[PDB]
Design a protein around this ligand. Structure first.
Ligand SMILES: *[C@@H]1O[C@H](CO)[C@@H](O[C@@H]2O[C@H](CO)[C@@H](O)[C@H](O)[C@H]2NC(C)=O)[C@H](O)[C@H]1NC(C)=O
Ligand SMILES: *[C@@H]1O[C@H](CO)[C@@H](O[C@@H]2O[C@H](CO)[C@@H](O)[C@H](O)[C@H]2NC(C)=O)[C@H](O)[C@H]1NC(C)=O
Ligand SMILES: *[C@@H]1O[C@H](CO)[C@@H](O[C@@H]2O[C@H](CO)[C@@H](O)[C@H](O)[C@H]2NC(C)=O)[C@H](O)[C@H]1NC(C)=O
Ligand SMILES: *[C@@H]1O[C@H](CO)[C@@H](O[C@@H]2O[C@H](CO)[C@@H](O)[C@H](O)[C@H]2NC(C)=O)[C@H](O)[C@H]1NC(C)=O
Ligand SMILES: *[C@@H]1O[C@H](CO)[C@@H](O[C@@H]2O[C@H](CO)[C@@H](O)[C@H](O)[C@H]2NC(C)=O)[C@H](O)[C@H]1NC(C)=O
Ligand SMILES: *[C@@H]1O[C@H](CO)[C@@H](O[C@@H]2O[C@H](CO)[C@@H](O)[C@H](O)[C@H]2NC(C)=O)[C@H](O)[C@H]1NC(C)=O
Ligand SMILES: *[C@@H]1O[C@H](CO)[C@@H](O)[C@H](O)[C@H]1NC(C)=O
Ligand SMILES: *[C@@H]1O[C@H](CO)[C@@H](O)[C@H](O)[C@H]1NC(C)=O
Ligand SMILES: *[C@@H]1O[C@H](CO)[C@@H](O)[C@H](O)[C@H]1NC(C)=O
Lengths: 68, 404, 234
């Protein structure tokens, strides 16, 4: 936490570098929170950006309605 | 006879900066003998570490439950047209690389050893994205996204539903839609100028930050306290005094530091409980004021509540309460009932209104005089039971159908 | 009316949901995780209180009888005083922690009391206060050092696209729905509620007239059915 490992699978984050876990570009649901926009999870252990949710862009119109 | 659209701001804190306290090197430093003597004090540092981790995860849970209210991220449509209404102040600016609204950017700009500042799980970026998704859901789907799946609705339809929820008919919406849009834009600009020109509008978050900083500074300064010892430096006592007593001096210094740490932990726990209560209140306001229309008075702003726009704040949340304020009252004459052929007529949803000569019916929240007919009135009882009944006739819409 | 239309379907859906969530409660230990964490905190407090008796507090022994029978009384009084004040500080720390936990538990109990006053003894119109979606009702249950409410909620599904209009201009007059909304399937306009699809013929019983149709924006032209003319034709 806050200790830069350049003067001590390496991924440098804002809180600190993570050793032993590889960074993945793809984003999934987090399991073990870490902080500073990153967290680790087990699937080997990997780290990825948080998945806020499924993207759903609703079509908006001033004359269209949706009735359940 | 007139209405005013007013925008009010409510600031509620969410959490604080997460702090981790290392007992061993703060109380005794790098001295091995002091650490060995501290090992005979029990599990005080372990208990404090457990309490601090519990406070940190409590703050994380509060931040998750106040911001991540929906599991679906909604994106604004490419066309930013809502019948003349303006929302660029609350929508994120694509020009800014931070993906934050100008109101959010101004709000962020207006807010400024053994202790490690643990960063929060949710930083500014995904909190701003959550607020943008919630704004898109409440500007496109209304309150339906908070009630299950997203049900698209036009903005005038949502506004008409919201004013129908507070007992105002939708006829006045179509007659003065441009007036409503202009009043909303003027109120948004006025509240933006007011928040830009008022440094004291962020008093709660600034006070919380100042209290945390003062607590950290006080804990730092307690290391220089002698606590009745010969000196405040452990190494000076070790290299200048006999051990037989020097161990008593070390014990006195470490129990003074432990008492100061206990005071800090109690203060942090009290502050965390207060902030948890404030975050529960903020979550209730997010669930009620923003995700729907609340009929509660004074809960979501002054007067009748229409909607609330959430914005991202540093260690807090700011609600843009847009409300309905009646204005320009006019004197009028009432009547308990209308006596027609020995029958008493009462309004179904409005009240009898008179300007001095004729008698009409109008809503409680707006002056909309209509002809007194049998469709909007019901008959229950005769005229001698009520007190102060006036004499007037009731127009029958069915009568001209068979008159000719 | 839709409740009486498909009452058997509603009952079957409710029974299936109740059975599914009853099966899911056994396989999900995270539901009672808050109560388990409270019990674990209680056990941790007891363990800390037990372990505090093993602390020497800078002395030579953790037993005061050993100090009394082992060390000279003129300074054994000071040693016993030091042990007394150390254990007193530990007890004060435990008391403050218990008081903070009591404040948190009292706040949670007040919140639960408010929830059972709102959406157990009656129907609450609050959105997502005690259940996701349009909350219908809740079923209170008893738990060890906790309370579980089986919240039943109304969730709309199977949305359909439709074309809507602010009003209907008929005979130079604008007609607004009293409680529903005007929808169009492509050729005809119908009125239905905002939470279900029940199309109906545009009739003056559920619509009111307020002004003409040249002041509104986005209106369409359609006739309005009134049964008075067919009643008076024959
Ligand atoms: C109700 O108040 C609004 C303003 O609060 C009035 O709108 C103004 O109307 C005058 C003339 O009609 C214009 O010169 C102003 O520019 C309008 N103000 C705004 C902010 O647009 C409105 O006329 C009032 N209605 C009644 C019936 O008195
Ligand atoms: C909505 O409000 C924004 C901000 O007030 C308007 O943007 C301004 O537009 C004028 C001229 O159109 C410029 O002189 C200002 O510099 C703009 N301000 C900012 C902050 O960009 C915008 O025109 C309004 N209307 C719409 C439809 O967006
Ligand atoms: C009270 O309101 C009624 C309705 O507007 C007024 O009656 C109209 O008054 C105007 C001008 O005085 C006349 O041109 C209309 O012919 C009247 N209508 C009818 C049906 O007769 C009435 O004058 C108002 N009373 C006061 C004291 O202002
Ligand atoms: C309003 O109408 C009522 C009923 O037509 C009037 O009440 C009558 O008053 C007279 C004398 O005041 C009595 O002899 C009748 O017995 C009353 N009838 C009833 C049904 O009460 C009343 O006077 C009228 N008010 C005004 C101001 O003209
Ligand atoms: C919209 O709905 C209406 C009523 O549900 C449809 O009108 C009916 O269409 C069927 C199909 O041919 C006819 O058999 C009926 O006689 C029609 N009823 C009336 C009262 O005209 C209409 O076709 C639907 N429109 C679309 C585009 O599906
Ligand atoms: C909807 O109905 C209105 C009124 O029936 C139409 O307005 C008239 O349109 C005709 C020709 O389109 C003109 O000659 C009249 O002068 C209009 N009257 C008024 C009061 O505006 C309107 O055009 C209709 N809309 C559509 C799309 O046909
Ligand atoms: C750690 O140090 C390296 C070089 O010493 C530097 O490039 C890097 O930015 C540092 N990491 C952080 C988070 O500052
Ligand atoms: C409604 O949308 C149409 C485009 O589909 C546009 O031409 C029209 O101007 C819009 N009306 C309002 C009041 O924004
Ligand atoms: C309604 O239409 C829009 C675009 O026209 C589409 O995105 C949406 O999926 C449609 N709704 C349904 C239920 O298919």
């Amino acid at each position: 936490q806050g200790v830069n490992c350049t003067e001590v699978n390496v991924f440098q984050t804002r809180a600190g570098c993570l050793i032993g876990a590889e960074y993945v570009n793809n984003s999934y649901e987090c399991d073990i929170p870490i902080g500073a926009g990153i967290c680790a999870s087990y699937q080997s252990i990997i780290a990825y950006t948080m998945s806020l949710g499924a993207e759903n862009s609703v079509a908006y119109s001033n004359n269209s309605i949706a009735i359940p | 006879t007139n209405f005013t659209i007013s925008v009010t701001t409510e600031i509620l804190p969410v959490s604080m900066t997460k702090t981790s306290v290392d007992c061993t090197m703060y109380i005794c430093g790098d001295s091995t003998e002091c650490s060995n003597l501290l090992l005979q004090y029990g599990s005080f540092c372990t208990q404090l570490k457990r309490a601090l981790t519990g406070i940190a995860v409590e703050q994380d849970k509060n931040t998750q439950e106040v911001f991540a209210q929906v599991k679906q991220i909604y994106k604004t449509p490419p066309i930013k047209y809502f019948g003349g209404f303006n929302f660029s102040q609350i929508l994120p600016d694509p020009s800014k690389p931070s993906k934050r609204s100008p109101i959010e950017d101004l709000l962020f700009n207006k807010v400024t050893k053994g202790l490690t500042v643990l960063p929060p799980l949710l930083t500014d970026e995904m909190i701003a994205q959550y607020t943008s998704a919630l704004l898109a859901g409440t500007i496109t789907s209304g309150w339906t996204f908070g009630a299950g799946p997203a049900l698209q609705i036009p903005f005038p339809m949502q506004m008409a539903y919201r004013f129908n929820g507070i007992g105002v008919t939708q006829n006045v919406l179509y007659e003065n839609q441009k007036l409503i849009a202009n009043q909303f834009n003027s109120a948004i600009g006025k509240i933006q100028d007011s928040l830009s020109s008022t440094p004291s509008a962020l008093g709660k978050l600034q006070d919380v930050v100042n209290h945390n900083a003062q607590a950290l500074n006080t804990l730092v300064k307690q290391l220089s306290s002698k606590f009745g010892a010969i000196s405040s430096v452990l190494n000076d006592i070790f290299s200048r005094l006999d051990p037989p007593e020097a161990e008593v001096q070390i014990d006195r210094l470490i129990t003074g530091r432990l008492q100061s740490l206990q005071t800090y932990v109690t203060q942090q726990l009290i502050r965390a409980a207060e902030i948890r209560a404030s975050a529960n209140l903020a979550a209730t306001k997010m669930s009620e004021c923003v995700l729907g229309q609340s009929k509660r008075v004074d809960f979501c702003g002054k007067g009748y509540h229409l909607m609330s726009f959430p914005q991202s704040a540093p260690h807090g949340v700011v609600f843009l309460h847009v409300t309905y304020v009646p204005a320009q009252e006019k004197n009028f004459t009432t009547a308990p009932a209308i006596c027609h052929d020995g029958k008493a007529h009462f309004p179904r949803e409005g009240v009898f209104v008179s300007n001095g000569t004729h008698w009409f019916v109008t809503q409680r929240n707006f002056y909309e005089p209509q002809i007194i007919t049998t469709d909007n009135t019901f008959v229950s009882g005769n005229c001698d039971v009520v007190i102060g009944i006036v004499n007037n006739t009731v127009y029958d819409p069915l009568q001209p159908e068979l008159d000719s």
